[PDB]
Design an enzyme around this catalytic site. Structure first.
Site, PDB file in Angstrom:
ATOM      1  N   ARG A 125       3.401   2.600 -10.971  1.00 55.14           N
ATOM      2  CA  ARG A 125       3.674   1.166 -11.163  1.00 55.14           C
ATOM      3  C   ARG A 125       3.668   0.773 -12.647  1.00 55.14           C
ATOM      4  O   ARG A 125       4.511  -0.033 -13.095  1.00 55.14           O
ATOM      5  CB  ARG A 125       2.647   0.318 -10.390  1.00 55.14           C
ATOM      6  CG  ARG A 125       2.686   0.548  -8.888  1.00 55.14           C
ATOM      7  CD  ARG A 125       1.536  -0.164  -8.169  1.00 55.14           C
ATOM      8  NE  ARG A 125       1.321   0.426  -6.860  1.00 55.14           N
ATOM      9  CZ  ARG A 125       0.348   0.054  -6.031  1.00 55.14           C
ATOM     10  NH1 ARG A 125      -0.504  -0.899  -6.394  1.00 55.14           N
ATOM     11  NH2 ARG A 125       0.215   0.659  -4.851  1.00 55.14           N
ATOM     12  N   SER A 126       2.713   1.305 -13.418  1.00 52.82           N
ATOM     13  CA  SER A 126       2.635   0.985 -14.851  1.00 52.82           C
ATOM     14  C   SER A 126       3.903   1.412 -15.584  1.00 52.82           C
ATOM     15  O   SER A 126       4.374   0.712 -16.506  1.00 52.82           O
ATOM     16  CB  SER A 126       1.416   1.664 -15.480  1.00 52.82           C
ATOM     17  OG  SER A 126       0.169   1.110 -15.034  1.00 52.82           O
ATOM     18  N   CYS A 140      -2.565   0.721 -13.489  1.00 51.76           N
ATOM     19  CA  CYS A 140      -2.604   0.726 -12.032  1.00 51.76           C
ATOM     20  C   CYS A 140      -3.763   1.647 -11.636  1.00 51.76           C
ATOM     21  O   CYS A 140      -4.833   1.562 -12.252  1.00 51.76           O
ATOM     22  CB  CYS A 140      -1.228   1.097 -11.470  1.00 51.76           C
ATOM     23  SG  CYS A 140      -0.415   2.589 -12.223  1.00 51.76           S
ATOM     24  N   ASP A 195       0.821  -1.213   0.000  1.00 46.38           N
ATOM     25  CA  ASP A 195       0.000   0.000   0.000  1.00 46.38           C
ATOM     26  C   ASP A 195       0.858   1.269   0.000  1.00 46.38           C
ATOM     27  O   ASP A 195       0.475   2.273  -0.605  1.00 46.38           O
ATOM     28  CB  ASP A 195      -0.923   0.046   1.240  1.00 46.38           C
ATOM     29  CG  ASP A 195      -2.303  -0.594   1.026  1.00 46.38           C
ATOM     30  OD1 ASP A 195      -2.583  -1.242   0.003  1.00 46.38           O
ATOM     31  OD2 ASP A 195      -3.151  -0.437   1.948  1.00 46.38           O
ATOM     32  N   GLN A 239       6.535   7.924 -10.507  1.00 45.78           N
ATOM     33  CA  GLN A 239       5.910   8.986  -9.706  1.00 45.78           C
ATOM     34  C   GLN A 239       6.737   9.465  -8.522  1.00 45.78           C
ATOM     35  O   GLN A 239       6.401  10.516  -7.943  1.00 45.78           O
ATOM     36  CB  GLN A 239       4.565   8.502  -9.139  1.00 45.78           C
ATOM     37  CG  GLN A 239       3.437   8.478 -10.135  1.00 45.78           C
ATOM     38  CD  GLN A 239       2.140   7.920  -9.525  1.00 45.78           C
ATOM     39  OE1 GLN A 239       2.045   6.736  -9.168  1.00 45.78           O
ATOM     40  NE2 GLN A 239       1.162   8.782  -9.369  1.00 45.78           N
TER      41      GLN A 239
END
Ligand code: JOV
Ligand code: JOV
Ligand code: JOV
Length: 282
Positions: A221-222, A215, A181, A262
């Site tokens: 994440r992508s 994502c 998370d 990110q």
């Protein structure tokens, strides 16, 4: 510089935030005018994540062709990817319309439906064989065929039917279920194992349309997934694998979608994944 020793040099000097901010400063800025039209407000999950006009995927519809999705075309590596946000309640039919129209074989999902106690994307595929889904706005039917649950990821076989023509296709759903998370994984081993399973299926290969990867926003994440895949492919193709420059590859990908990777922690994790992956390949 090479990668593994550039890596230790940034760790010892603690300058990941400065490296990452340089990337943000040098990244491309292109218009995203279609994304910002008022009629598309409920088609965007986040107001600050939009597809560029020049690379956006168009739906084959005359009313409204807009979806929050981008085509990343890597010329030297000879790989293409579609990066998109997690579907919203009012875009699940658009999502499967795109999969159909672009002739994709596989869908890669890097988030859970609920994280941090909040919804990160719609429940857009069926969970039981005998309870199929019908998307009336785009005239598609989706059925769960089989499911294989492993410790770090789940693979599903799905049947997508175009109800207008009665054509059917098999779609593979690759769901990485264990990204934490908060932060990034401590080791890249399970993420690399997952990438190799997607590769082995054929979903990334030129005999199919581009893989669809998402994502929640479709950039963090992508971005890590396609950056690691492309860097490892270039290391196999070139005479000198130490010439592959991960920062340059990332800036090339950011010509096609804003914001890929990110955080500085996601940048460090991407380096780690490519470094470890390059040892297993040989
Ligand atoms: C994807 C297919 C061809 C499958 O039936 N559907 C459509 O293109 C579509 C789009 C918008 C509205 C409606 Cl009814 C169908
Ligand atoms: C397996 C067959 C031959 C249909 O039986 N092909 C597909 O299912 C398929 C999947 C993805 C894209 C496209 Cl064009 C076809
Ligand atoms: C077949 C090769 C050796 C590529 O030539 N690599 C793998 O199969 C693999 C499997 C899992 C993880 C990682 Cl990094 C690589």
């Amino acid at each position: 510089m090479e990668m593994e020793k550039e890596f230790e040099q940034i760790d010892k000097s603690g300058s990941w935030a400065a490296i990452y901010q340089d990337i943000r400063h040098e990244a491309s800025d292109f218009p995203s005018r279609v994304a910002k039209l008022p009629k598309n407000k409920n088609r965007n999950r986040y107001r600050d994540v939009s597809p560029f006009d020049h690379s956006r995927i168009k739906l084959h519809q005359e009313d409204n062709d807009y979806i929050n999705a981008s085509l990343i075309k890597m010329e030297e590596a000879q790989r293409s990817y579609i990066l998109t946000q997690g579907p919203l309640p009012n875009t699940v039919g658009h999502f499967w319309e795109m999969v159909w129209e672009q002739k994709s074989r596989g869908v890669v999902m890097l988030n859970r439906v609920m994280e941090k106690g909040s919804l990160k994307c719609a429940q857009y595929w069926p969970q039981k064989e005998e309870k199929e889904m019908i998307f009336e706005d785009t005239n598609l039917k989706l059925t769960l065929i089989s499911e294989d649950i492993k410790s770090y990821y789940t693979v599903r076989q799905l049947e997508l039917e175009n109800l207008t023509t009665q054509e059917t296709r098999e779609i593979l759903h690759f769901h990485y279920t264990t990204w934490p998370d908060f932060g990034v994984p401590e080791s890249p081993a399970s993420f690399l194992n997952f990438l190799f399973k997607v590769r082995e299926s054929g979903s990334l290969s030129p005999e199919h349309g581009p893989v669809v990867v998402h994502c929640s926003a479709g950039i963090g994440r992508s971005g890590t997934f396609c950056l690691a895949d492309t860097c490892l492919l270039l290391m196999d193709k070139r005479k000198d694998p130490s010439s592959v420059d991960i920062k340059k590859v990332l800036l090339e990908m950011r010509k096609f979608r804003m914001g890929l990777i990110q955080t500085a922690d996601q940048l460090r994790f991407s380096y780690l994944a490519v470094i470890e992956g390059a040892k297993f390949i040989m």
